[model samples]
Target: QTVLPFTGLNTPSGVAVDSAGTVYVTDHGNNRVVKLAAGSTNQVTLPFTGLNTPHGVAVDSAGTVYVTDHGNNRVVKLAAGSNTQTVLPFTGLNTPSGVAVDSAGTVYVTDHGNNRVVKLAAGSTNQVTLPFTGLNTPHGVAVDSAGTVYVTDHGNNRVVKLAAGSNTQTVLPFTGLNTPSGVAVDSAGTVYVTDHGNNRVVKLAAGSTNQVTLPFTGLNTPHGVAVDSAGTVYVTDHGNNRVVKLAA
Candidate 1:
């Protein structure tokens, strides 16, 4: 069964859980960020607010909350242990959708509407579009420990690899990735994708063939996936309006 936290979440897009298991979800339709205690999955309504069509979420080591507002095409940061937020407020992020952060706190985002990937240094407003600088509908983003980026390009039915600080593209094209919407990169450079059109998730090794994980079987329109420190995978099921957690 899928669990929805509140109203106005027409197209919930991203989620992240901290060490404490506190859950933060983006309400794309409501345009806000909401926090919830772990295991209280049955609770209704969100704990925080003030966002604009939030699409992606990633937390820093310090517990600060970061989110992408697709409608506003920008990212926002809510200070750790506080509800107040500081908007990065940039105009170049064309319909920003998914986001991931590296160990160094650098931010990577998938500009879906722009079909490109953009990076922002910690505490900086400047952004540099990276790898496959031009795309045809890039959706989600994930980062590995080494700072490599993986993105899902829905229109092209492919996944892209972006090395640190470069715009060259290393694409992993597969016919099964029909309209993928979310992607996550593990420590070993494995790329996990949420194939929205296929109703499942698939993994692609950096230098090998496609290895689709069945741990997430029965997924209906999975839209986003996040890898926890413990190697657990959490996926957002848009068709079901619920988030499923897969333990390592």
Candidate 2:
């Protein structure tokens, strides 16, 4: 089963799946977000409103949505089952691009235009800078089971890993990516990234130097991606205006 396009979803950019297999999409062109319940093809409405060019999206265990409001130059939170919004301020964000929340609900954002990544502790607006600076147009960010942070340095054409809370980096990195954007790490620590400019998905094995290509093909301007516990891959085919699911 592939090609999971919801009713009227356009220019879908960022995508994520919750613990229950619920799929959430940031419908950028339509200026809204939508969700599809597990095992269903129907699109359900989220109370998210008044968004401007929503770029990236991440959902925590509690079902809260952390999205980068690109046009508004900020990130906002939408708690599940509520319409009210909370805009997170982590000073020096300009054209924020991607977002990810760790197990503790700490938020990480790719300050795209500013060339840095900012961290917001679980319950505070105070921002903390991650170790590896000097990034070029960093686009996607995700944390692993071990709490290691992964970033897709789009302009630099490489992926970087930072160890938990030590201002240190992984000795090896995912190199030679082509404008890679969305990123995710599964329960097993394998890294999956969307090589947006190359129009394909690449996997960096936990201990390998080579990039492994999945079996799916014929995608168009693909961007964000997510993996379910079962290991099914979800990718937003931005140019095709749909999401495609690949077998685990």
Candidate 3:
């Protein structure tokens, strides 16, 4: 059953849940990011102004927030408990769409227009692109605790995974998917995705080849997905202009 429905979002695109269970979403159409505090019902806009087409959002272990300011073609970082925004120094990014931060603080972003994923190591200024080739419009990215990277190849209608240390990319065994956009990996290794074209959310359990559709109905063009430590799921219901929460 859908546990909660957060309304009034404007084409929300990306969502992230912090360790404390606070939810952050990129209200894309509204050009701002909003936060729903842990156990709170109201959504509060962050102290950011002038955000242009923010598309993806992520929260690190330290509670620092990262957002892909897509329209500006850059990434912005907001320190924990701070209102200042620091534009990250990732160069040559064209329409960067998705962002993720790992437990070790390494940051990963899907450079949508460039058709590649880039990484910024923790405490490092240099940015490097992952070695996967032939990606088309990679929209959503998630990094597991083991550092494995998963990307939703939206244009290709498939999902790809890059193991922690491997250069090769492996496509997950989901068939007949149309425009899979949002992805999230739970601590138990279960992978959830917003199958946009189908207007539903699905999950692939660890070591399983089958996909299971979540018990969510009437979703319209869902875009972003996140799973908290307790296994609760949150999705950005884009076409419906809302966020839906599914309890574990």
Which candidate's TM-score is highest? 3
Against the true structure, candidate 1 reaches a TM-score of 0.86
Is 2 or 3 the stronger prediction by lDDT? 3
lDDT tens per residue, model 1, 1-248: 33434444456678777777666767666676666666664533443455666788888778878888777777877767675677764557788888887788888888887777778888776777675755788888877777778788778888877777664878875556689888876656667788889888777667877566546757777788766566667777766666777766
Best by lDDT: 3
TM-score of each: 0.86, 0.95, 0.96
* lDDT, candidate 3, 56-147, per-residue tens: 99998888889999999898988888978787888899999999999898999999999999999887789998987679999999999999
- What value does the lDDT take at residue 78 in candidate 2? 90
Question: Cα lDDT of all candidates, in order?
Answer: 0.73, 0.86, 0.89
Measured with C-alpha atoms, the lDDT of residue 35 in candidate 1 is 64
lDDT of 3: 0.89
Question: Higher-TM-score candidate among 1 and 2?
Answer: 2
Q: Model 3: clashing residue pairs?
A: none
Spell out the clash pairs found in candidate 2: none
Superposed Cα deviation of residue 196, candidate 1 (Å): 0.7
